[PDB]
Design a protein around this nucleic acid. Sequence first.
DNA 1: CGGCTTACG
DNA 2: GCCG
DNA 3: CGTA
Length: 329
Amino acid sequence: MPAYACQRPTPLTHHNTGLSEALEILAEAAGFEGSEGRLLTFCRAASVLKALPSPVTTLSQLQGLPHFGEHSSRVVQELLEHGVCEEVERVRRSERYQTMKLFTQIFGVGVKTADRWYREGLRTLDDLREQPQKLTQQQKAGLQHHQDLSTPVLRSDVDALQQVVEEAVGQALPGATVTLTGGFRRGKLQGHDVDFLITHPKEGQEAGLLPRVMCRLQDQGLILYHQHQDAFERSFCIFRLPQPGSWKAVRVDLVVAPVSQFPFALLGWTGSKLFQRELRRFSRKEKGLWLNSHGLFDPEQKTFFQAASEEDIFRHLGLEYLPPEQRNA
DNA sequence: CGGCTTACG
DNA sequence: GCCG
DNA sequence: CGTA
Ligand SMILES: Nc1nc2c(ncn2[C@H]2C[C@H](O)[C@@H](COP(=O)(O)NP(=O)(O)OP(=O)(O)O)O2)c(=O)[nH]1
Ligand SMILES: [K+]
Ligand SMILES: [Mg+2]
Ligand SMILES: [Mg+2]
């Protein structure tokens, strides 16, 4: 079992679901407390279990697995022996965890904002609604749409959304394309949002595209919130999606890249978040190359790698290719 | 011990 | 919290 | 700060 998540396939569904869930509770709780190193280790240990070919049934099967030391092994041991881990259950029922989870779910609220509200004594969404002076416009939109945004987006919703985005994109710039990215490209059947990557085959034609796309969608009445409702290339918006006899709010992320950068942008925005962190760490620490969603930089030659495909990028990094479905770290 | 992904809005 |  |  390799030490980096980008060195092994990780399928969406696997054989250690309960164990990985518990470790991810501890990871999440570590993040709420600002302990990013502990979050990383608990996330990595959970991901190792996702990559295993069969269920862990005995403690001895953790021998030699990377990212399993005293703490993560004790969590697994307790789950194997009793079906529950006391530390995990204490986190689950704690007021701090439940409130930080609730608050950071709000679009526009991160750990730092949630933690400040917690320290001020706020605990519920209605507590926030009674203090609208504390809220940015983004947070007001996240708070008002929170119920809809807590409802999973279905794969059957995604096709309808892509067609409406493609219509606006085609008027904004004929020839521009829309590619589904994020969790749905990795094979997920539901999601917290829908992620799209937009480009044009002629380099440079994509300059200035996203404002034109957003104004066309807003004219169609489809945009419940976006940050520009001057030049921008990413938009994190709330969209109006049809439902039977009604509509529901859905989060949609739109990103524009030049076609020269499209393989890097596709790789970055396809995720998973941990897969990409691991891939970028691998690139820098093991290969001495700097990876981001725009390119891959050799800091000694001071040169950028040209890539025509995701396959190119894996080859550059000396990694076996993983299709999106196996990037579910 | 230092390190822990890396951008744009 | 774990790795190198 | 937020988003990814
Ligand atoms: N490098 C990097 N990439 C990131 C980061 N955050 C997001 N991405 C990339 C990788 C992510 O795949 C992509 C957008 O994915 P999401 O919509 O944030 N989540 P997903 O679609 O997996 O699941 P669901 O939506 O159902 O919760 O942006 C980050 O901090 N760093
Ligand atoms: K949030
Ligand atoms: Mg997504
Ligand atoms: Mg997204």
